[PDB]
Coordinates of C-alpha atoms in Angstrom, one line a residue:
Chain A
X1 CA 33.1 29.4 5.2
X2 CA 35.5 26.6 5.0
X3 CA 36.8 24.4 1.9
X4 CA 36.7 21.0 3.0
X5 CA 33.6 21.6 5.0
X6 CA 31.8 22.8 1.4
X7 CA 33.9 19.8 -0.6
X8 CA 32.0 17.0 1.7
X9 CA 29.0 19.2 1.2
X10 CA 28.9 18.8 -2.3
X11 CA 30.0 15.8 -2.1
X12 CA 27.3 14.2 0.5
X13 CA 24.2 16.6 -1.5
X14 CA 25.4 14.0 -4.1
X15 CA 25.2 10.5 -2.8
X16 CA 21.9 11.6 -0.7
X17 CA 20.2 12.6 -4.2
X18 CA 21.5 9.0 -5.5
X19 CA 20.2 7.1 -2.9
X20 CA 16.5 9.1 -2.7
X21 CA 16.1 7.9 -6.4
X22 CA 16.6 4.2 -5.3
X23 CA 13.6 4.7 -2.4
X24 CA 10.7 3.3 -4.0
X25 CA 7.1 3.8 -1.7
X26 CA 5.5 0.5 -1.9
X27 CA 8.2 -1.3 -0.8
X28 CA 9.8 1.0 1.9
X29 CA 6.7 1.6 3.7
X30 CA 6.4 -2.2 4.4
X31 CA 9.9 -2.2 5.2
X32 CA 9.2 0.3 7.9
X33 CA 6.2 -1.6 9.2
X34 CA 8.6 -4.5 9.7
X35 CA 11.4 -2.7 11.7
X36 CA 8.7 -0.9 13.7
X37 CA 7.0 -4.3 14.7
X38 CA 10.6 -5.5 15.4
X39 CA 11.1 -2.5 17.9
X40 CA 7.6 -3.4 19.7
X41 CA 8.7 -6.9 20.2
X42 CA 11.9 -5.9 22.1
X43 CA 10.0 -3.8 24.3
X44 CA 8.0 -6.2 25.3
X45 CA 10.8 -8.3 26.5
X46 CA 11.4 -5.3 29.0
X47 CA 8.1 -5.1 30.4
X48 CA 8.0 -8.6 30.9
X49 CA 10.9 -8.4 33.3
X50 CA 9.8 -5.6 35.6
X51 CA 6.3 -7.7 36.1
X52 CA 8.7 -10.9 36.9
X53 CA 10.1 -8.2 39.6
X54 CA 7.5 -7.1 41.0
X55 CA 6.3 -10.8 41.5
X56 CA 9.2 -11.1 43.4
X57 CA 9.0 -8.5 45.5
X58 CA 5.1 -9.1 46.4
X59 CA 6.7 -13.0 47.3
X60 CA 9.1 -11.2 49.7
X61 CA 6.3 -9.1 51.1
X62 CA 3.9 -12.2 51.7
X63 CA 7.0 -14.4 53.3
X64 CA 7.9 -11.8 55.8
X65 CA 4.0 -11.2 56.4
X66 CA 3.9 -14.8 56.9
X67 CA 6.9 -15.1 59.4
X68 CA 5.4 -12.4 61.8
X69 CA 2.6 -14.6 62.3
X70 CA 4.6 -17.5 62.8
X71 CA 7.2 -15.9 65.4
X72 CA 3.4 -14.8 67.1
X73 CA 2.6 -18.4 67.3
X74 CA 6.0 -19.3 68.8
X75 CA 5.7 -16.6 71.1
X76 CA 2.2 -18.5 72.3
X77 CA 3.8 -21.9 72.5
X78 CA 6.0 -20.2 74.6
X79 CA 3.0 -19.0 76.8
X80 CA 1.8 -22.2 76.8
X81 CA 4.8 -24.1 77.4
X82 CA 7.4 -21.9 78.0
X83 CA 7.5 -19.0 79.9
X84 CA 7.8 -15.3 79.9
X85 CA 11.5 -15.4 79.1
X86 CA 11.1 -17.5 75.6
X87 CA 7.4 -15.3 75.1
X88 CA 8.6 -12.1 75.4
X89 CA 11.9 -13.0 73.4
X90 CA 9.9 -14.3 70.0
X91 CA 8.3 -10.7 69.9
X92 CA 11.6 -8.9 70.4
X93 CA 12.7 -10.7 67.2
X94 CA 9.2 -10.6 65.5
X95 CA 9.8 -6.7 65.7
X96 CA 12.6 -6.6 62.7
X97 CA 10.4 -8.8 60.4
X98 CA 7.7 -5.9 61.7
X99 CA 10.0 -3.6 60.6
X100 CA 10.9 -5.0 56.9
X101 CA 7.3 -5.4 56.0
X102 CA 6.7 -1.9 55.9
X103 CA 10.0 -0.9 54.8
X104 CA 9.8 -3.8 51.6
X105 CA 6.0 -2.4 50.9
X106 CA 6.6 0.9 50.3
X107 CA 9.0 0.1 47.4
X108 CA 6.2 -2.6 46.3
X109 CA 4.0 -0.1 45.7
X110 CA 5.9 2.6 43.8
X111 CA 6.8 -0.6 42.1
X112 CA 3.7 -1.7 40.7
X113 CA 2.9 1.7 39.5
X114 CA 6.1 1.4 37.1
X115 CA 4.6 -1.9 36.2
X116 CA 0.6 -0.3 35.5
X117 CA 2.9 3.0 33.2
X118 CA 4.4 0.3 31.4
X119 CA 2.1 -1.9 30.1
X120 CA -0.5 1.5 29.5
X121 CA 2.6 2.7 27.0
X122 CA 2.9 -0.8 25.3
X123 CA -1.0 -0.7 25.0
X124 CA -0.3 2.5 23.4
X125 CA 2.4 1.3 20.7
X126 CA 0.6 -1.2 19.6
X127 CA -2.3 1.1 18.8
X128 CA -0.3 3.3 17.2
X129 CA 1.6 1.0 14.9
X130 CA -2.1 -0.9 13.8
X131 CA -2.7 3.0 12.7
X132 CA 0.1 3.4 10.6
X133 CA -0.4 -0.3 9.0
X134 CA -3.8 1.6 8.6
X135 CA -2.3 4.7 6.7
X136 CA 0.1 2.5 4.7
X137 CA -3.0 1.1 2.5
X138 CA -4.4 4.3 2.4
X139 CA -1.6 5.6 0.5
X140 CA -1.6 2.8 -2.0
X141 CA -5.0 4.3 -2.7
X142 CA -3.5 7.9 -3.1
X143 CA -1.0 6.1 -5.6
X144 CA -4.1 4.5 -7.2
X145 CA -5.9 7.7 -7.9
X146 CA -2.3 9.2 -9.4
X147 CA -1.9 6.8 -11.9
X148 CA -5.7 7.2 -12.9
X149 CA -5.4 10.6 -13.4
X150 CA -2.5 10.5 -15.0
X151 CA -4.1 7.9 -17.4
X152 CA -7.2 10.6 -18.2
X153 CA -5.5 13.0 -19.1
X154 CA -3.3 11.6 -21.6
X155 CA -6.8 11.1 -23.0
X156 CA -7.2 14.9 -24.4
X157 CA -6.2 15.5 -27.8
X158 CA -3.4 18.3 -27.4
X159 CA -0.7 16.1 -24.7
X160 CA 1.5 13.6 -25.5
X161 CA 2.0 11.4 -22.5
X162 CA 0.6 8.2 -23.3
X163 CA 1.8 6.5 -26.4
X164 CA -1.6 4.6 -27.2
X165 CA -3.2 8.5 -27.8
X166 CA -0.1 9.5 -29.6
X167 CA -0.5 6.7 -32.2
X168 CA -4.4 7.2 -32.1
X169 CA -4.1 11.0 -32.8
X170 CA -1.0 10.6 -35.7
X171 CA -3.7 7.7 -37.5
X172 CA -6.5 10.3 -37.0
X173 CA -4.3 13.0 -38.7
X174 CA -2.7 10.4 -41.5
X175 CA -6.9 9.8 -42.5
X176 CA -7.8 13.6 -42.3
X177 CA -4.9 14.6 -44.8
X178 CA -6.1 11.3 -47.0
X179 CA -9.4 12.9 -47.0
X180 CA -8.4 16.9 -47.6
X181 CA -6.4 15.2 -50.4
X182 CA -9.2 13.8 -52.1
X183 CA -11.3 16.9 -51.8
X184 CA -8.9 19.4 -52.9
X185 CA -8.3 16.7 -56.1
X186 CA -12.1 16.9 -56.7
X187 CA -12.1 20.5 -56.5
X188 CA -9.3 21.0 -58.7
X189 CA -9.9 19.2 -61.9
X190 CA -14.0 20.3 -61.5
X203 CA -31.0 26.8 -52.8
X204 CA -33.6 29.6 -54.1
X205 CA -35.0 27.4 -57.0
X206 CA -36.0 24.6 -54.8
X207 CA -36.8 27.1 -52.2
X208 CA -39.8 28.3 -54.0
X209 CA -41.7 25.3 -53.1
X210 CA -41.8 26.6 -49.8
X211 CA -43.9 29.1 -51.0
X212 CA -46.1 26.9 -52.2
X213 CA -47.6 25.8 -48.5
Chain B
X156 CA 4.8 11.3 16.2
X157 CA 4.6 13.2 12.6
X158 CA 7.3 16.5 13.2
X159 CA 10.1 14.4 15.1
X160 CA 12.8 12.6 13.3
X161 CA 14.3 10.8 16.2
X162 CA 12.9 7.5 14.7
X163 CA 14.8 6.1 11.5
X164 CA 11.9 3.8 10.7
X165 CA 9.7 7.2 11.4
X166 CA 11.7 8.9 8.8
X167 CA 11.7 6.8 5.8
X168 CA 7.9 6.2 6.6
X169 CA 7.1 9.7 6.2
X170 CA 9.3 10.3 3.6
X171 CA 7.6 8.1 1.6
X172 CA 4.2 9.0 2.5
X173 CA 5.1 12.9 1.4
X174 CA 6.7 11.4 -1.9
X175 CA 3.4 10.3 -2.9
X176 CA 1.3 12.9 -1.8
X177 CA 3.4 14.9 -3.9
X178 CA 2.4 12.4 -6.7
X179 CA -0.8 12.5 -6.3
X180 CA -0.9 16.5 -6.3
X181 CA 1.4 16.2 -9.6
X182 CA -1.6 13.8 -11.1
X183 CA -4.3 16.9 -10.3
X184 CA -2.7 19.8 -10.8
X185 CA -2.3 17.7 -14.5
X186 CA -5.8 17.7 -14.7
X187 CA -6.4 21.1 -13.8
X188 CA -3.8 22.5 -16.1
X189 CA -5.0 21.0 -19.6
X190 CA -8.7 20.8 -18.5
X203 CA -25.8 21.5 -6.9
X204 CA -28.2 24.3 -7.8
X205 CA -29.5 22.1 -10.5
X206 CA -30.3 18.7 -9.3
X207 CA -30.9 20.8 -5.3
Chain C
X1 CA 20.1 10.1 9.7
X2 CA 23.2 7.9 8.4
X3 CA 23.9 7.2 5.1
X4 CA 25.0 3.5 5.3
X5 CA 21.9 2.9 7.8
X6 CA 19.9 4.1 4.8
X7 CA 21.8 2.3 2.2
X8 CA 21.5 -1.0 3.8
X9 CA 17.4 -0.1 4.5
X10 CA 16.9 0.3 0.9
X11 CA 18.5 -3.4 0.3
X12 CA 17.2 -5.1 3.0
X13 CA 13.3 -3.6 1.6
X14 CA 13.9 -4.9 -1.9
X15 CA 15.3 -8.2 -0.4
X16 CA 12.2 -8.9 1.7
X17 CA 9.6 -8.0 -1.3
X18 CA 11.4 -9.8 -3.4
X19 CA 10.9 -12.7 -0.6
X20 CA 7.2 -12.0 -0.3
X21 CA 6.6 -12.7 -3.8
X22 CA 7.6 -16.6 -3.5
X23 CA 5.6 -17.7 -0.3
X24 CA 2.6 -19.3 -1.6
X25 CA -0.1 -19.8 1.0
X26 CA -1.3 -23.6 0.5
X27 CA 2.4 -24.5 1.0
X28 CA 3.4 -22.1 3.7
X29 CA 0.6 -23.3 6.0
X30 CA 1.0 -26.7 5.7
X31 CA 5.1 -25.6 6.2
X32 CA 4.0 -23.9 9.0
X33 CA 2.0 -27.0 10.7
X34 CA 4.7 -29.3 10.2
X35 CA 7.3 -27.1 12.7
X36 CA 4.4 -26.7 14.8
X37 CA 4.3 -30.0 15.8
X38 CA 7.5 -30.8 15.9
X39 CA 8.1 -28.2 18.4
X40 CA 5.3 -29.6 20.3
X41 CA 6.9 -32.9 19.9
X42 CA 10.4 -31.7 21.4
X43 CA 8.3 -30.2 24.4
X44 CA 7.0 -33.8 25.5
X45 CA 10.5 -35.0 26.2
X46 CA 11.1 -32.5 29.0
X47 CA 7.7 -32.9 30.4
X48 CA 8.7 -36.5 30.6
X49 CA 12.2 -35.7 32.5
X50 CA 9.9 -33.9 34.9
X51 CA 8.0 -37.2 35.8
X52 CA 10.5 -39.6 35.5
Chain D
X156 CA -1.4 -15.7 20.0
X157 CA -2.2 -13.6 17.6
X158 CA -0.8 -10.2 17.9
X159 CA 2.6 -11.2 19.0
X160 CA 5.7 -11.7 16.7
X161 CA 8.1 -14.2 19.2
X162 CA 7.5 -17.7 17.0
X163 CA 8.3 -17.5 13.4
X164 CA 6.0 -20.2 12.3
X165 CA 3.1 -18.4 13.8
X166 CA 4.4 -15.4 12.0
X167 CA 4.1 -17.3 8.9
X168 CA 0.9 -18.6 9.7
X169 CA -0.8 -15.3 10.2
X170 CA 1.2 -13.6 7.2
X171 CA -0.5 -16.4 4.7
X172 CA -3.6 -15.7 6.6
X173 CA -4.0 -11.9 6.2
X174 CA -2.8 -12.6 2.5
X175 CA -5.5 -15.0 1.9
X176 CA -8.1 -12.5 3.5
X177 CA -6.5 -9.8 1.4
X178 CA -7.1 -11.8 -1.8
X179 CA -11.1 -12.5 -0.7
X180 CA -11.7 -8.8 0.0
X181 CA -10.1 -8.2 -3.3
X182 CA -12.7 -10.4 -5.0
X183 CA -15.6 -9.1 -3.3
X184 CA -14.4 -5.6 -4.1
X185 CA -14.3 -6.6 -7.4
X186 CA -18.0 -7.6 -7.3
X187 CA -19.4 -4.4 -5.8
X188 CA -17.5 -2.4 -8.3
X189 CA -18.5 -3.5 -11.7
X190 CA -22.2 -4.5 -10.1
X203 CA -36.7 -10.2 3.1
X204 CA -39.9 -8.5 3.5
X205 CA -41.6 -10.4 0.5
X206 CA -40.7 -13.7 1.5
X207 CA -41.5 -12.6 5.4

């Protein structure tokens, strides 16, 4: 396709091959642990304000519940001292704050569902993130099992990959030669009798 | 979630978990390559 | 993702082991005590301003 | 509290705690490893 396009190819396949030998497990998996944790504490933050919201909504609700009642009352004293003028005239006003109460509930409502979603998903973050801190030590122990296989089987006599078995096996060697050496010099400057007995008994 | 790399936290997280499962498979296949009827 | 997001992530996670090799518990918890209380002190005061 | 991250001493606190309890079950693990009817 294009030049420059395959240049910064080249170019980025590079640096991205640098920097994935610099990752090292142990210590990027706690790193990620940490940013995750930091993530779950700023959502909290946000959960925390819709709940201070919906407090103030239910306040509202009560307050306007409250003032219908009272404006009731009035209209009474009005009955009792009064008459039908002031009476009828508290109930003519009590009918807005009738009003608002059912128009401020129905918002409450779908508000405190918002309010149960969120703190069910936060409920659910934090399980999920104790499960990964889970995983995390459970790959130590995959590391763990690597590097004790890898020390058994530099054990076997024909693979180099442990220096303590390479200088082990190049003594061995050095002491067999020693010994060939002292057999060959014995050879080189220099049972059928016994086996009758057995024929005896 | 495992397949979704929206998260970069996710991404170093399971790229590290696959670098040493591929460690771990280098250690056996090692083993392998250089090498209940009974006790039932 | 990024490249300098993943650069600085890789500096940040040797910074922070290298960190969490030097806190020692006896000390840390004593360490960690000390500021307790003395954010508990700091509280009494405005309790106070909200008698007085 | 414990599961929350907003105070840094508490963080801290619990981090030298779970390192503490990390060092015990390290010990006892050793122990396992390398190894009341009668008084009823």
């Amino acid at each position: 396709m294009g030049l420059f396009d395959r240049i910064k190819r080249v170019v980025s396949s590079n640096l991205n091959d640098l920097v994935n030998k610099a990752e090292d497990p142990e210590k990027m998996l706690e790193q990620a642990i940490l940013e995750m944790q930091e993530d779950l504490v700023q959502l909290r933050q946000g959960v925390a304000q819709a709940i201070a919201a919906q407090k103030r909504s239910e306040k509202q609700y009560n307050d306007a519940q409250n003032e219908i009642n009272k404006w009731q009352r009035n209209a009474q004293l009005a009955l009792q001292k009064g008459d039908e003028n002031l009476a009828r005239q508290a109930l003519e006003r009590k009918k807005t704050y009738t009003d608002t109460s059912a128009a401020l509930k129905a918002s409450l409502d779908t508000q405190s569902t918002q309010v149960e979603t969120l703190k069910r998903n936060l409920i659910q973050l934090e399980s999920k993130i104790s499960e990964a801190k889970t995983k995390k030590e459970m790959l130590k122990a995959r590391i763990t099992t690597a590097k004790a296989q890898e020390q058994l089987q530099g054990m076997v006599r024909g693979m180099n990959t442990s220096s303590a078995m390479s200088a082990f096996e190049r003594m061995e060697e050095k002491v067999l030669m020693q010994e060939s050496r002292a057999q060959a010099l014995g050879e080189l400057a220099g049972g059928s009798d016994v086996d009758d007995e057995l024929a005896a008994l």
